[PDB]
Amino acid sequence: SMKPHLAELRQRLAISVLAVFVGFIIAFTFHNAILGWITKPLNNALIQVGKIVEKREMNGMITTHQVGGAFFVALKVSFFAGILMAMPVILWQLWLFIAPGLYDNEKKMVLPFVVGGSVMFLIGVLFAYYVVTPFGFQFLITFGSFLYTPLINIEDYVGFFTKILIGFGIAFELPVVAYFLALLGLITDKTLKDYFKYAIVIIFLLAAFLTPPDVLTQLLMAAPLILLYGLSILIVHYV
Amino acid sequence: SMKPHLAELRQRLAISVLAVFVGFIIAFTFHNAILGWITKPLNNALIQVGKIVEKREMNGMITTHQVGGAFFVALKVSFFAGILMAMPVILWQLWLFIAPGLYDNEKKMVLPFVVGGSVMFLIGVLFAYYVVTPFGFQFLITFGSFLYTPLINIEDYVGFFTKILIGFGIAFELPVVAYFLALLGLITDKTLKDYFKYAIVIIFLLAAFLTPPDVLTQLLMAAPLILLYGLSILIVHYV
Amino acid sequence: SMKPHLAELRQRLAISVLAVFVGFIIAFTFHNAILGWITKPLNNALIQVGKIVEKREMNGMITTHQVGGAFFVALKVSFFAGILMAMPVILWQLWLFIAPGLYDNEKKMVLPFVVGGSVMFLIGVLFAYYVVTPFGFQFLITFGSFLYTPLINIEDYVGFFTKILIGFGIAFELPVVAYFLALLGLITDKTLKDYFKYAIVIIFLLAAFLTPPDVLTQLLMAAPLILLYGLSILIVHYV
Amino acid sequence: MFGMGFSEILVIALVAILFLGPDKLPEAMVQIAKFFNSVRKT
Amino acid sequence: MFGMGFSEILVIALVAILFLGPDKLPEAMVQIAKFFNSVRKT
Amino acid sequence: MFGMGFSEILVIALVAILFLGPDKLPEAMVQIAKFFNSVRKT
């Protein structure tokens, strides 16, 4: 039963792990460049907020509060870039494992799905980096500019920044996963509406997983998911 | 069986959630005032410690280490204030759900109990804010004034301050719940004394629940609970 | 069955708890000395890095980001010193609980093991403090010296520092536990090699427990454990 | 447990009562139990 | 699991052993098991 | 749960599949179940 599949899975999981390790080495060789890319929007926000602050009066900068914070951030950023660099190998190995299983009817809707899903994920990250972050970061820092001093630490920033970038990519993949399921025909407008009663519970179940144990973080994450489900209604309604 | 009690519970939970949302909106309209009220003791403590330090020699201020720290702190404070403001509606809905169940004999003991518990919680919160905090914060900051620089961040400070206020509010409700039970008559000194053996285990379980996974926090929270149990023993003995 | 053993366990667990409390009181009386000993390498690293950064150009210091950070750190350091000071009493009580159980054949191997294991743990802590930390701390701070400002907080430093000290002590006790099991004769080179397949899973299970939920923390801790196993392979091979 | 607190649990149940409502909550309750029983006997 | 580490469990068990003591711990052990069995058959 | 995340578990499983391999994984599965059954009947 599982004897031939586990032998095949082992030799494909080995290649994927190797790809991450090689991607990690390449990412760590250029960790200054990747950190500069990640850290650049924050420097723009702090400098831009500083000019507003130094105008009402007429400082803040990026810090690290752990001894190993700089090294760990470089590893964490390199690890994340390594997984992203290994995604073509990981997905190619994933496809080769399930390619014989899929029938020839639905085998030609997987490559466009992977290409379409990946290209939409890239747009989500670029949109979050170049359109959302420059205005979002400036607004957030300005909120506590007249009250507190923004001594932003890199350890908590990288996690905050990577979640925004990763989250927006998936936030763009939800309106295309539903669209892909719509043209072929598997769910209609009614199906995505009469299953909302459960779907709200799963959304709050998903919100709890991806947030600290605070309720506010749950609601602050359940609200975007509700709208993504809402946009999914019109996408199926239009098709 | 549970059909009418679920039909009735739903329409009261809806009203409670609406009250919480309205309270959140009202609190966010005045988030600056509540944040100033919360951070007023910290500023006074920092100024006093600065005077002491600059007298011994012959700086520290409120910061934010997260990009979304100020906005999240405002949202959290507004959420807590909204829950507090919706508590009368929440409690009124709770009473209407259990009012028919309670007999007329003990129905006249609930409203005085609710009034007494609310007034004692308010007295505890005011005591923590106006009597305990001015000395405690100053002493804690002066503890590490000759070694470290107090760069207090708002994100953890808000949680610490709200925990202090809530814990002192409930810590005043424990000696009055026992008093209310003793006046009517349900437990005596012997019952609260020979049940201490399980009571200490329950206290430590609660301390573990309400503290980070550190053992030191568990002990530091269990000691006040033991003292509260002793005060309850004394209160029951007096009656 | 357990009636006589629980009466004996209770009276020996009580003595160990008393030893911790007495050790805690003694540790708190000298908390300035222990904190100075703990924090001394951090000051040396910051001063030494400062001379480098004030040479390329031709600041950073120890802070506290919580109100109760200075007091809690003093308690936490005192608590750790209390447990260490109570170890002779705890181990003596532990031995007295199992002394009749152990046969006379292996009773004369426990005392050399406890003395040998403890002396190796002490070497590990001293080696970490005097040989590893001066180079490790300076390298870690210099890594993010040209990008970020090192505003190290004492709360996260104590957790980081004692983990290095405690971990290196156990990291030196693993190569002597393996030796003790080898000189008497219970496992050989082959047994420690053909059981590696379970060992690698157990190591990642242990690394998961002793690290935050991040995978990178798991990998960064599984790597030293694998090398300890590799060294333990050679130890049995020589004997 | 996996990032979910206790107060986290109550909100999810709070959504469960509000949206599933009086009906359709027992239907989900017996479906979860059947699903829980399904994996037990397999 | 919900805010409690392994050390928290060990401390709780330590207080249990110290305070319930030799007797009255088996009484609690069979009461907890009976309570655990009570919810199982209901 | 005790300091172990979800992504933490998959790595542990990944080591299990990768190192134990095709054989010796079913042997481990039936040994864990036997050990799990052993503590149940005791």
Is the distance from CB of C9 to CB of E20 less than 8 angstroms?
no
* 3-state SS, residue C102: coil
* 3-state SS, residue B64: strand
Residue E36 near chain B (CB below 8 Å) = no
Kindly report the CA angle at A148 between A145 and A151, in degrees rounded to 5? 95
Of E4, E8, E12, the CB nearest to B201: E12
Residues C53 and C154 in one domain: yes
Is the distance from CB of C55 to CB of B142 less than 8 angstroms?
no
Residues A127 and A210 in one domain: no
B143 neighbourhood in chain C, CB within 8 Å = 70-71, 74
Residues C68 and C180 in one domain: yes
Beta bridge partners of A153: A63
Which tokens hold the place of A164?
A: 């925004």
Residues B175 and B208 in one domain: no
3-class DSSP string for A138-160? HHHHHHCCCCCEECCEHHHHHHH
Residues B88 and B146 in one domain: yes
E1 neighbourhood in chain F, CB within 8 Å = 1-2
Please report whether residue F1 resides in a domain: no
User: DSSP string spanning D10-39?
Assistant: HHHHHHIIIII-SSSHHHHHHHHHHHHHHH
Please report whether residue E35 resides in a domain: yes
Asked if A214's CB is within 8 angstroms of B76's CB, the reply is yes
Neighbouring chains of A at 3+ CB pairs under 8 Å are B, C, D, F
What's the number of domains chain F is made of? 1
B219 neighbourhood in chain E, CB within 8 Å = 11
Please report whether residue E1 resides in a domain: no
Experimental determination technique: cryo-EM
Please give the Cα distance from A77 to A66 (Å, whole number).
Answer: 16
Return the H-helix or E-strand segment holding C150: strand C149-150
Nearest to B67 by CA among C155, A142, C153: A142
Q: Compute how many other C-beta atoms are within 10 angstroms of the C-beta atom of residue B64.
A: 27
Asked if E2's CB is within 8 angstroms of D1's CB, the reply is yes
Question: Å from B45 to nearest chain C CA?
Answer: 10
Return the H-helix or E-strand segment holding C186: none
Residues B169 and B227 in one domain: no
Q: Compute how many other C-beta atoms are within 10 angstroms of the C-beta atom of residue A2.
A: 10
Question: Å from B83 to nearest chain D CA?
Answer: 14
Please give the Cα distance from C106 to E26 (Å, whole number).
Answer: 33
Return the H-helix or E-strand segment holding B63: strand B63-64
* 3-state SS, residue B150: strand
Please give the Cα distance from A28 to C144 (Å, whole number).
Answer: 14
Please give the Cα distance from E26 to A128 (Å, whole number).
Answer: 60
Q: What is the amino acid identity at position A123? A: I
Beta bridge partners of B149: C63
A215 neighbourhood in chain D, CB within 8 Å = 7-8, 11
Is the distance from CB of A171 to CB of A124 less than 8 angstroms?
yes
Which tokens hold the place of D32?
A: 């979860």
Please give the Cα distance from A211 to A209 (Å, whole number).
Answer: 6
Which range marks the domain in which residue E35 is found?
A: 6-41
Q: What is the amino acid identity at position C29? A: T
Please give the Cα distance from C157 to C148 (Å, whole number).
Answer: 17
Residues B135 and B213 in one domain: no
Neighbouring chains of B at 3+ CB pairs under 8 Å are A, C, D, E
Residues C11 and C115 in one domain: yes
Please give the Cα distance from B114 to B112 (Å, whole number).
Answer: 5
- CB under 8 Å, gap of 24 or more: what pairs does A220-223 form? A220/B75
Which range marks the domain in which residue C235 is found?
A: 187-239
Please report whether residue D28 resides in a domain: yes
Residues C117 and C168 in one domain: yes
- Cα Dmax for chain C: 77
User: DSSP string spanning B84-122?
Assistant: HHHHHHHHHHHHHHHTTTS-HHHHTTHHHHHHHHHHHHH
Asked if E1's CB is within 8 angstroms of D6's CB, the reply is no
Burial class (CB in 10 A: 0-12, 13-18, 19+), A3: exposed
What's the number of domains chain A is made of? 2
Please give the Cα distance from B107 to E5 (Å, whole number).
Answer: 42
Would you report the helix, strand and coil content of chain B in percent, each value rounded to 5?
80, 0, 15
Please give the Cα distance from B130 to B123 (Å, whole number).
Answer: 10
Resolution limit in angstroms? 3.1
Is the distance from CB of B183 to CB of B238 less than 8 angstroms?
no
Distance of CA A202 to the CA centre of its chain: 19
Which tokens hold the place of B72?
A: 């999240």
Of D6, D14, D17, the CB nearest to B6: D17
* 3-state SS, residue C11: helix
Residues of A with CB under 8 A from a CB of B: 42, 45, 63, 65, 137, 140-141, 143-144, 147-153, 156-157, 160, 214-216, 220
Nearest to E3 by CA among B166, B205, B160, C79: B205
Instruction: Name the packing angle between helices C31-56 and C133-143 (round to 10°).
Output: 50
Please give the Cα distance from A152 to A63 (Å, whole number).
Answer: 6
C42 neighbourhood in chain A, CB within 8 Å = 67
Phi-psi category of residue B50: left, alpha or beta, with phi > 0 → left and psi -120 to 50 → alpha: alpha
Beta bridge partners of B150: C64
Is the distance from CB of A67 to CB of C157 less than 8 angstroms?
yes
Q: Compute how many other C-beta atoms are within 10 angstroms of the C-beta atom of residue B88.
A: 12
Neighbouring chains of E at 3+ CB pairs under 8 Å are B, C, D, F
* Burial state string for A184-201 with b = 16 or more CB within 10 A and e = fewer than 16: eeeeeeeebeeeebebbb
Which tokens hold the place of A203?
A: 């959304």
Which tokens hold the place of C62?
A: 């120890």
Which of C186, C206, C223 terminates a domain? The answer is C186
Residues A149 and A238 in one domain: no
Question: Å from D38 to nearest chain F CA?
Answer: 19
Measured between alpha carbons, how far is residue A23 from residues A80, B46, F17 in Å?
Answer: 9, 48, 22
Residues C49 and C152 in one domain: yes
